[PDB]
């Protein structure tokens, strides 16, 4: 007869949520510059991250209920706020502005876009004031009622100046689970977004993920293997959206050809404000350069996938957004502290049937921005001195699905930035180990 035998260290687990914590190499801490990002207070990574493929181990992966995303999202938000509290508030900037057009090289290709305003601002000498001037984009200011203008934020909330020392450069972050919890990672090159994975491994911690904030287009992410990946909570439901992961990096090179200065103004007492000095150099609109043939080629590869989930006799059209809030309408992203808004109509304008060259994308610059759709506060970007230009890898699309028997139209979206984190964390899940187990064994225990 069999008896109850007690076992411990049993390799079993249940899907469960716990509090994850970060990890960050050791060179990322050497960037110093007075704590770049919200990271410094973070445990250095191991020099030898371990893993192990697990043979005969298979189970379900569900990226759409993966609460790792939710934590990461709110943690990044928390970091953001903490990095701003110790910085200078710009409350006394909320004044009537006296503004005029800026005579760019006649006649007018630049359309101005900035106004050289002036007003009596308070200084440290708490007794006598002085008249100063500064440049502001017409996206930041609005006419009251030269003419009178107002900082747009002042009708919604106060605004805080981001410190000139702190940066916004995305840094690779690793996530780790506490003892008793395991980080599981499928290596299956195929994945529908959920279901069993024939090839499952496990790791100590996750790979370095950069907290890149962007809409419509995904930047500097990871690459997919095999073919282009299409993932959606519900492909047939056009109230949902579609995640597209590329196989090959699509280069995009964006430029701001303005060697402008920073006429910092001592709006004390003590605290200093960085206003916009003068704009000189190649007065052209900021824009992005895209390899056209590359875009066409990749887009085609995407359409192949689409064909595979809609039929071998349907028509695929690509168009821009429905319009509305600029933040959603255009492609937003950060480069070097500056915030760009680009008209991606130049990309998302095509079609496919039934079965250099290069592209220039017009961009706009804003200085007053609102993070993560959050209202009640706003952040002022300081102007970055000198010409700003950078390059990155487009690694995926955030698409939405638009007389429904053939032609379908798709367009870029975003808004909810949990989407961005989820586009990477789908490779991971967290489980809780249960060491204690029992089993029937032929054994009668003596004294």
């Amino acid at each position: 007869n069999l008896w109850v035998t007690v076992y411990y260290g049993v390799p079993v687990w249940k899907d469960a949520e716990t509090t994850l914590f970060c990890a960050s190499d050791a060179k990322a801490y050497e960037t110093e510059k007075h704590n770049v990002w919200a990271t410094h207070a973070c445990v250095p990574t191991d020099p030898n991250p371990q893993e192990i493929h697990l043979e005969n181990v298979t189970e379900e992966f569900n990226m759409w209920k993966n609460n790792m995303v939710e934590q990461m999202h709110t943690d990044i938000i928390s970091l953001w706020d903490q990095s701003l509290k110790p910085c200078v508030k710009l409350t006394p900037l909320c004044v009537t502005l006296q503004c005029t057009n800026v005579t760019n090289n006649i006649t007018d290709d630049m359309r101005g876009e900035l106004k050289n305003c002036s007003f009596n601002m308070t200084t440290e000498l708490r007794d006598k004031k002085q008249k100063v001037y500064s440049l502001f984009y017409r996206l930041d200011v609005v006419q009251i009622n030269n003419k009178e203008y107002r900082l747009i934020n002042c009708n919604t909330s106060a605004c805080t100046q981001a410190c000139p020392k702190v940066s916004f450069e995305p840094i690779p972050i690793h996530y780790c689970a506490p003892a008793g919890f395991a980080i599981l990672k499928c290596k299956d090159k195929k994945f529908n977004g959920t279901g069993p994975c024939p090839s499952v491994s496990t790791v100590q911690c996750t790979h370095g993920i950069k907290p890149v904030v962007s809409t419509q287009l995904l930047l500097n992410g990871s690459l997919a293997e095999e073919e282009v990946m299409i993932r959606s909570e519900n492909i047939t439901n056009n109230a949902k959206n579609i995640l597209v992961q590329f196989n090959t990096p699509v280069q995009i090179n964006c430029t701001r050809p303005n060697n402008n200065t920073r006429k910092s103004i001592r709006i004390g007492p003590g605290q200093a404000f960085y206003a916009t000095g003068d704009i000189i150099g190649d007065i052209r609109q900021a824009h992005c350069n895209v390899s056209k043939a590359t875009w066409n080629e990749t887009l085609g590869k995407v359409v192949k996938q689409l064909r595979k989930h809609f039929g071998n006799n349907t028509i695929i059209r690509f168009a821009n957004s429905s319009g509305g809030d600029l933040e959603v309408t255009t492609h937003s992203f950060n480069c070097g502290g500056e915030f760009f808004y680009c008209n991606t109509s130049g990309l998302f304008n095509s079609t496919w049937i039934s079965n250099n060259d290069s592209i220039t994308l017009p961009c706009r610059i804003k200085q007053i921005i609102n993070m993560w759709q959050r209202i009640g506060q706003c952040m002022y970007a300081p102007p970055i001195q000198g010409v700003i230009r950078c390059v990155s890898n487009i690694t995926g699309l955030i698409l939405t699905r638009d007389t429904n028997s053939t032609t379908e139209t798709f367009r870029p979206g975003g808004g909810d930035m949990r989407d961005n984190w989820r586009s990477e964390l789908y490779k991971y899940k967290v489980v809780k180990i249960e060491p204690l187990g029992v089993a029937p064994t032929r054994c009668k225990r003596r004294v």
């Binding site: 390799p11 928390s78 008793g180 187990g437 064994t441």
Partner: protein, 132 residues
Amino acid sequence: VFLGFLGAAGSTMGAASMTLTVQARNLLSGIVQLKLTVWGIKQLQARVLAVERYLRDQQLLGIWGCSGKLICCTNVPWNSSWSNRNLSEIWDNMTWLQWDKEISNYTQIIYGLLEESQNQQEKNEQDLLALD
């Protein structure tokens, strides 16, 4: 052979029992190593929860007179209603995860007798053997 943490997870319960310690060590793990700040009370909370998580069940093994754990016998007979299978149908043909899938239904029920029967009776008895 050293397999690694949970290295035997994908094997029969008999096989897995070989290397329970490799898992045991990391059930509590240890090491790990402007105020507050994000993470400031999260590493705190988590590391605490680890300690509690551990001892909560360890105490049960303290009560269930074994202590020298990973494996120990009892004087409680197995009720056939608790998944009536043969040893070869269980130990030589089933993983621990598959085991729990079924037996989990009677967890607290079995704990009742483990928490008690023997712990109660083993004692008294001994005191009586100490009479002489």
